[PDB]
Amino acid sequence: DDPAARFQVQKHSWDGLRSIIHGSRKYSGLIVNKAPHDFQFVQKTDESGPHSHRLYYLGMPYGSRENSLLYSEIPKKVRKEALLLLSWKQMLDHFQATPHHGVYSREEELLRERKRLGVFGITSYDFHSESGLFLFQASNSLFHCRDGGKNGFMVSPMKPLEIKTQCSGPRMDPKICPADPAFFSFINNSDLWVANIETGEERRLTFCHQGLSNVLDDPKSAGVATFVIQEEFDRFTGYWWCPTASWEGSEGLKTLRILYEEVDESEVEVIHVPSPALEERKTDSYRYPRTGSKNPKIALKLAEFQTDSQGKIVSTQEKELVQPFSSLFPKVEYIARAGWTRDGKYAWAMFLDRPQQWLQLVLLPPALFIPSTENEEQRLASARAVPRNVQPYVVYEEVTNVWINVHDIFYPFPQSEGEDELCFLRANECKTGFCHLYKVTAVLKSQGYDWSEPFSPGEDEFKCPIKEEIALTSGEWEVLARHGSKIWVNEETKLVYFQGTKDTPLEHHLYVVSYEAAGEIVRLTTPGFSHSCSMSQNFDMFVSHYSSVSTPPCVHVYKLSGPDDDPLHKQPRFWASMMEAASCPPDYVPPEIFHFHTRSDVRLYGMIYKPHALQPGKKHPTVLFVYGGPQVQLVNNSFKGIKYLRLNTLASLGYAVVVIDGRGSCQRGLRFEGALKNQMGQVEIEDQVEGLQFVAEKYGFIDLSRVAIHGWSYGGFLSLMGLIHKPQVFKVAIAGAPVTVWMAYDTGYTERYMDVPENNQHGYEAGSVALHVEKLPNEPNRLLILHGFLDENVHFFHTNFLVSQLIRAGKPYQLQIYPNERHSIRCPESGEHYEVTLLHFLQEYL
Amino acid sequence: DDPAARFQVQKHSWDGLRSIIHGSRKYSGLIVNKAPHDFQFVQKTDESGPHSHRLYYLGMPYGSRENSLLYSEIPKKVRKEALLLLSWKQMLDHFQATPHHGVYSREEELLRERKRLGVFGITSYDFHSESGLFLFQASNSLFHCRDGGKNGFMVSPMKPLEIKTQCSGPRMDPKICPADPAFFSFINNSDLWVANIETGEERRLTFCHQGLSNVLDDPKSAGVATFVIQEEFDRFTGYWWCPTASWEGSEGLKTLRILYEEVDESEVEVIHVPSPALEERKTDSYRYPRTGSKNPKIALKLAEFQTDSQGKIVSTQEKELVQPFSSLFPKVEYIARAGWTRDGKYAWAMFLDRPQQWLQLVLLPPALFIPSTENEEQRLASARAVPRNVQPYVVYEEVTNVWINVHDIFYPFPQSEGEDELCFLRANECKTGFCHLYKVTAVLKSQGYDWSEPFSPGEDEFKCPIKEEIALTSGEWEVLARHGSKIWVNEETKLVYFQGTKDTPLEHHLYVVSYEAAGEIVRLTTPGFSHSCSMSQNFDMFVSHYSSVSTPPCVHVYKLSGPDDDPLHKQPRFWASMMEAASCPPDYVPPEIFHFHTRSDVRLYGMIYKPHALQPGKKHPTVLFVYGGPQVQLVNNSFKGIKYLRLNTLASLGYAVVVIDGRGSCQRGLRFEGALKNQMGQVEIEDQVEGLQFVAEKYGFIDLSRVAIHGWSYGGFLSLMGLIHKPQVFKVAIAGAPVTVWMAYDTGYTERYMDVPENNQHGYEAGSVALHVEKLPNEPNRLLILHGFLDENVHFFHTNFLVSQLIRAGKPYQLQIYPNERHSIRCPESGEHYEVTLLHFLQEYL
Amino acid sequence: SPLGVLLKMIHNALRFIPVTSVVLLYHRVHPEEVTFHLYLIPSDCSIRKAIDDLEMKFQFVRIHKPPPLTPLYMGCRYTVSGSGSGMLEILPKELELCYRSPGEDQLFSEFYVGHLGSGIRLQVKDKKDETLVWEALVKPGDLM
Amino acid sequence: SPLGVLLKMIHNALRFIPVTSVVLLYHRVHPEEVTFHLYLIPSDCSIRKAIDDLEMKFQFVRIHKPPPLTPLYMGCRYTVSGSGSGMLEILPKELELCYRSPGEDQLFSEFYVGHLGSGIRLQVKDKKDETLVWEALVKPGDLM
Description:
Chains C, D: This is NACHT, LRR and PYD domains-containing protein 1, C-terminus. Chain A has about 850 residues and is α+β, with helices and mostly antiparallel strands.
């Protein structure tokens, strides 16, 4: 209204904008830290030495670039009121954990894209307690070392021993056999192998990958987590060692089972996406299941083998279920998770159906798996041989009207007390609406099965009835399950430690409760922060990597201490600190958290970055940054500097930056998340708009006439929905990587927050933004589409089809391609271009 | 300088710019006509009827949309001084020759992409005079009809008889056998078939293809023109019927040979290009040979077959040369052209070298081709059975230091006088620097070869010595040979009719000369226009489709008439008119042609579109439209309204549009074209800058501070070279489809203009504009990259690699994708968007 | 690369939307409820009598209607709007010129009005820029 | 679509980048001419003593080596200019700081000037923005 009261952003040159991004970069390098993670406590068991434990973890010292296995020494006694900052001692002697300039295999770079591992080095390692074995993958070759088992500990770093192989190709996903630490296993060429460290002997176990031709002609993999499982159900391994050693007893031999998922991806649609080597101009085929198309044909299988005291894999044996998996378990589309009970009695698996409103946990006893041979008389022979009593037990069956979120919390107790009737813990969001722990006791009542003849299962066929389902937590908050959180169950003191949002939805706190009675929920963390924690296996001391919206992340080591007769009220006392809180840059202003109520009177939270050098009276251009989609919470009391520095850069140029989590964003329960069910894309923008009008009323520096909506994945999809359905409020829309047609996106995501296109035709037509292109603005320079060309998650087709329909409707745009970047702009030069393009676009056209 | 004395273009809204483009489109529906083409004169042979001939041709009558076979009736006499306009009688009775919404096969769309033929319907037809057979490819399947052979001249339109088939896929490239009009041939599934129209009997002849898998695995094709031949040597067929029939003399059987090209595309690199069906998100493999990579391994082969009296394929036979083609003819990389002598005695072929500097014409007599079997004793058997005398005759050998342009003019004569020493006509540009016709008589003296043993021929081992080489034309002008021009040799009167640029390079005129004595060159067309001509087979009347820079194209029928004792001075008198000059737009100004000299005193021609409603004194912003590359001349005295209407739209908004024929363009001889040898980019832009300097000095409205350089394909490439090496003169640069890295481009073009990568290293890095990206401007809004995503010729990789290197150098751009358009923007919606984007970009940032 | 130019827009598509304006607005009145059809199909004039006698044989009655001011094109889509569209029952509100043979039957647009009163104003715009290409209204004094 | 935050920008630039200039400036007085080796290796501390011992038993000298103030971002090549480049011989110009293990001889820039005299200038800068990363002139005072 008043051009003397509308703040004008200073028009910088392009080189000026680069100078700003580099000044962010210099400070930015110090701000980013790649905090220590994957903690592993080991006791010292000396009672006369100085150190009580040794904590092993991944980290980059900063002396070097790549993160490596390290350790700290946790003492028996701290000097009180004088904080111990741990030394970061190196296990390995400064070798390259990754090859030169970050070259990987194509499957390794894909796995780092699914896990979103931006950091280089030893990204994941595996550990075996008693042997003290550290098996990891460095520079596309397995390595190992040992530290304090039957051997002793160290103070100097050693050489990491390389594992010699005759196999040609990368050896992915290594795991130590817990039953026998001399044995390990890995995936090679999408087939399961097994080896032995000291003798070097390797041995293939599966034969599903012929290696003959392209992946369009060689479709069976084994022990490999497929695309939709990797990228929507957060499962990356597809094989699970049996943790105990059984003895079939020929004369002295020892069996070692592995449960694995065989996958026959022949009948699933293949799409070609450009390879990283642009000069070659070739693509890679990808078995990408489009929405509505048929998922891979999955199955569980036991690859067993038998060994001797000399340490040689003497026998081997593939086993498969007595009936085919699809027929023995109808309505089972995806194996969400799997593993074993710790005694070894049963192999468990979480199944999940195609509507994703029907999840059920099942126990599969190893005798249910007969050997596998093409001879149908041997097959009938062992179908006769399997006992009548043994049975898969569908132990738990979650059914819902919204969708099942995969909760990987499942702690089966030992059941040797009362020798039947498995008792386990299980997170259940569908029951009350919020993810809460339960102790559930089911009854394994086998009725007796003739496995030779083929039967058709009924609707509640193997479903065991529940003895009891005591509720350990309740409230308007949830127990954190997904995204690699976990519980820790001390069975000696009979306590279950979980993480949750009980104090407030914006913070993750470590809580403990007893699983005998839901007496009280004891918080073990300071309020006003959000915590990512990790316990000792002895349950005496933990790490917490925590932060707040103002303070950077610190990593403090706490020690549970108190009278042992009352373990539930053990006081966590700060013992020592690992990585203390970094320096916020002087130009960095921590942002302000707010909340508000909608017209439906639901509470939404939001952030705001205020314009630096704010002048009262002046109205400012506002960038509504947005994601707004499920399984992601933008707004929480946590450090927004290491991942959202760009929002601060905008603020430092004078843009108000608003961030709102409307309905759909997680950690606020299923009924909250479920407001987007079959209308995803439609309700979020009303929540974002209402958030603008509230912030406009509350703070007086929000100019409604100049609003930009910027998003990247689902956020870019929403930014385009914003510009379509709310054109008068949103001036411009920087839509990065947008999902423009839902019918093209993959099954796991879309089939869950909407459903199959035959079911929701109105929801797909109203949600696919590329089919609504006529309502985009006729004015130019109001829409900037950003897209990484080699994308495998939100394929380039989406931007391409949007640009196609813009062409057909005669509407302007702008477009920026990142030819070498998959889904996140990975390379810093390309990211710097992205940021200077964003600043320029806002500078000129907002 | 004087900001009150420079023109500011009226900034229109986006919808305004669409309104302007639509108002241009309101009469481009008038100015495009698709003037008739592929004329075939047939006499009426009546001597008492009213019409002397019937002219058959292709045309869209604008009572219909798709072009169709038509005819006109040329009368015996005309009332003089009152012009006769020929009616467009429809030959067929208004059926459609395209499916709904233009859906074609992928091979049809690729072949139309190759010839750049944008109009719909019957693309092209084949004709046999004696039977009066019109065999053409319309819609789903081949068709044929007849008019005035042994039957009579119809007056109503008839029905097109369909050719039924048991074969699947499209039937591409159909041709009538000249010796027997009942038989015809086509390519299907990249193998040569032959059929018979009346009985329906078909027969495959080649088995180099199997259709086992994709083209990555089924690499041998036969009788089809490969990519590089289709797109750089303008040959679209790989099989040639023998024009005469020999008699095997078993009992009565009539043999019919076909020369075909075997192609082994195994070693040529494969590139994946996105399919037109974006939803499927798959690619197509394309055997695309980069510079330095292996070209396809070629060979010539004889496919014979023998028929009964009743017209049934009695026998068939593949034949191959007695020694391998690669061994008999080393240094032969491409078969530019091929065919047969008119008497049928020898099959000729133009070979061409890898560096395209060693073209040589060779005759291959059919007895040189033995049958082809795996039995090496039958092979040796017929190597003895071949006579000693028969021999390939390297008849002609053009060698140059610049490059050989493929001139397809080669008219061998009957050699009935003194039955050795073949006398032929041949266009030769390398001799004098300009394409001039010659009559050349080479003496065919066979030395006698033992074809049983395999030997290696020497350097000029089959080279016949020349008897004589009379030059029929000479001067500083050239005879048209490329771009589907041709000569017409009246052997009755001993005249040869050709087209040339003897008056001026801006016009194409029909000339005639005698080949008995190189006498006087008679022009037949009126000067002040440029003409595309086509003679009768009886050489009594021709058509000329002509135009000027001011007048639209008309199509007039001229008649050679005069005393027969001196046929060289037969006066072409205007007989009748077929198509008149259309109505020019109300807001079209004709552009002005100019010329100027360089500092080296080399004459360059140029165009200019003056700004509409020019006020003298004001300086207007100037769009240098450019192509600049070889084999294309933008400026000539022809109508520029149909292809360059956007240039007039620019003028109508107020932009001066300048067009300069830089050095290296065609129509002006080898020494002119050869200034870009190994320096593509390094001389053309200097000539363009020079042209701008000249037009700025001559006309007073060229603002040098506001210069846009716009180009497409090769022209865009120059626009980017302009912005790199002449940044202070070009304000902006709209690069459409640029060739940004020469090392990725194909063999046929690049290996000619430059050399193999090891040879011209500095030429590739200097010319590859994407490797000089650091010199692109730091300023934004100075570079707009346009690219069709599905491009087969200048692939998307080029723009992608440019954008990659812009990202790595931190330089801004803008980008526009046309997701459906391959290389020429073909869809009108996409072309309208392209032009409104161009007007907007110039409006705002120029 | 031999001059991959844009080639403008040929739009070889004119003068036929007048002769497909006359086939528009087919009305059937056996009771006072009336139903309507619309046809827009290019490139010939022998389609006209076939579709006209087709709707004559299938009991739809004629009326002369305004031709478009500027004729439309094929390969592109147009919208149908107006006072009677939306208020009264237009199930195919999207039309499109695409060639089908003179003999064969066509895509329509079913449009019920019921008791029409005295007039039903209708529109066929283009989906490109929504220019008011075509205008009409039907008259019960010209109904059968 | 699990929110690539896409902040990226992980250069992870090391404080070793000042002492990568210390590896820089190796010269050898074996003949009448003098010549130089240039190294820039971060991501290992042992590369200092490794290339030190390697190039003194390969008979080269260590010079002053002024350090860059900015710990330089990794992933970008740095160009070489000055009065030296363009008059007296420098075989490669640009340096990509890439890791190798300390037991290997790295990429180095070789710089021949013949007689020394008053000195000659060498400069190391970035091609990304052309800001000064490093700048010095050689000594006639730190020689045998």
